[PDB]
């Protein structure tokens, strides 16, 4: 269970690359406080296509644990700097035209029961190219990340100053053309298994 | 000569792509005010290598006008939304290890003679991958863009509120490993030819 009692960030990667065990991840841009990092080459095109197909074959939502998800969760754990036992698992979302996710927080309300082991960081991976729309936007920061296949946006909200955590308000913009496929890894403060 | 007398941005591209005449440019992220846009697939790897070689063959600095520079300046003009006659031309810079560009503004001081036709926007294109360091950082915004071959960072400073223009303070971080090659297009308020 993480402890921020003496302002630091969980993500501690320096430089322009993250050399994971099976892939070299690109660091594209950083908004430092609260920490929002745009990452390139997080997933290959083949991995993006298969997470989409796995979500479709299960629909006929969190994915079931095979060898692809475990491989990606280990690579994600190197990126987010938290062991994979904190991750809720790969959650796959699909936005058709005219669908969106309005602005919200990822950490749970303090009075909620899920806040006992609350989330601390999020990684959103873009599994396909969106013809128009579907950007990840942060209203209080006037910042948006646009979907691009293989890329991802990282942001954390484990600050002592709650003002910094409240700036991580974000949503998914309406898809106007095409469709949007994303994979999301939420990281809990403690072991989630 | 541009006129902002009735707050709008010169860059007006919507969506996730910029369909220029010879290339589809990716919109990666946007910091909206002041407008800073991270762009992908701005230059091919072959174009990046040749602008570097052209700078080296001229050293033995602004490049001379051939067909490659005119082709890129036309593509850049579609991105920056200003005719190429406003551009100063492709300026190539090389940072070795232990070299940097400290924080500064791109528009000239108001009492300077170059401020008669002052700059309004800048595009910085990364011509190679930097092993470590060399990020384009904006201190007053706590934002940095890291170098990635083929990508570019766009930002403009033609706002009526001078507070917004003064937030475009930026520099090139010290290169600690490898080297950094960039192409820069500065756009003047009026025709520069
Ligand atoms: O659609 C987006 O870009 C944001 C996705 C998101 O908010 C999430 O899955 O946690
Ligand atoms: O080195 C950088 O990333 C910034 C380049 C720059 O400031 C310029 O060429 O105008
Ligand atoms: K594909
Ligand atoms: K869900
Ligand atoms: K309650
Ligand atoms: K506060
Ligand atoms: K379509
Ligand atoms: K569909
Ligand atoms: K090359
Ligand atoms: K110069
Ligand atoms: K003067
Ligand atoms: K002001
Ligand atoms: K080296
Ligand atoms: K060199």
State the DSSP string of B22-89.
Answer: S-EEEEEEEETTTTEEEEESSS-HHHHHHHHHHHHHHH--BPP--HHHHHHHHHHHHHHTS-GGGB--
Note whether B135 contacts A: Cβ–Cβ < 8 A.
Answer: yes
Structure tokens at B177: 């490993």
Is B27 part of the contact surface with chain A (CB cutoff 8 Å)? yes
Who contacts B60 (Cβ-Cβ below 8 Å, separation ≥6)?
none
CA distances from A119 to A133, A165, B105 (A): 27, 11, 40
Q: How far apart are CA B54 and CA B72, in angstroms?
A: 14
Reported residue count of chain B is 193
Residues of chain A neighbouring B152 (CB-CB closer than 8 A): none
Calculate the CA B158 to chain-centre distance: 15
Distance between A45 CA and the closest CA of chain B, angstroms: 17
For residues A122 and A36, the answer to whether their CB atoms sit within 8 Å is no
Query: Chain A contact for B32, CB < 8 A?
Result: yes
Chain A hits for B14, Cβ within 8 Å: 132
* CATH class for the domain made up of B15-189: mainly beta
Residue nearest to atom 4 of ligand 2 (CA): B172
Neighbours of ion ligand 11 (CB under 5 A): B 111
Task: Give the determination technique.
Answer: X-ray
Strand-pairing partners, residue A27, are: A39
DSSP state for residue B189 in the 8-state scheme: S
- Resolution as reported, in Å: 2.3
**Chain B neighbors of A143, CB-CB under 8 A:** 29-32
DSSP state of A142: T
């Amino acid at each position: 269970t993480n402890n921020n009692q003496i302002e630091q960030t969980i993500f501690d990667h320096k430089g322009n690359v993250i050399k994971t065990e099976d892939r070299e991840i690109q660091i594209i841009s950083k908004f430092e406080e609260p920490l929002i990092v745009v990452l390139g080459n997080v997933l290959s095109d083949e991995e993006c296509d298969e997470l989409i197909e796995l979500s479709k074959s299960k629909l006929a939502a969190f994915l079931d644990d095979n060898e692809l998800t475990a491989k990606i969760e280990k690579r994600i754990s190197s990126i987010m700097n938290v062991p994979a036992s904190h991750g809720e698992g790969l959650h796959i979302l699909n936005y058709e035209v005219d669908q969106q996710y309005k602005a919200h927080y990822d950490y749970f309300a303090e009075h909620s029961r899920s806040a006992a082991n609350n989330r601390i960081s999020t990684l959103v991976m873009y599994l396909n190219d969106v013809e128009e729309g579907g950007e990840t936007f942060f209203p209080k920061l006037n910042l948006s990340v646009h979907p691009r296949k293989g890329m991802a946006v990282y942001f954390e909200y484990f600050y002592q100053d709650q003002s910094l955590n409240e700036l991580t308000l974000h949503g998914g913009a309406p898809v106007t053309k095409g469709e949007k496929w994303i994979a999301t890894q939420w990281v809990r403060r403690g072991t989630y298994k």
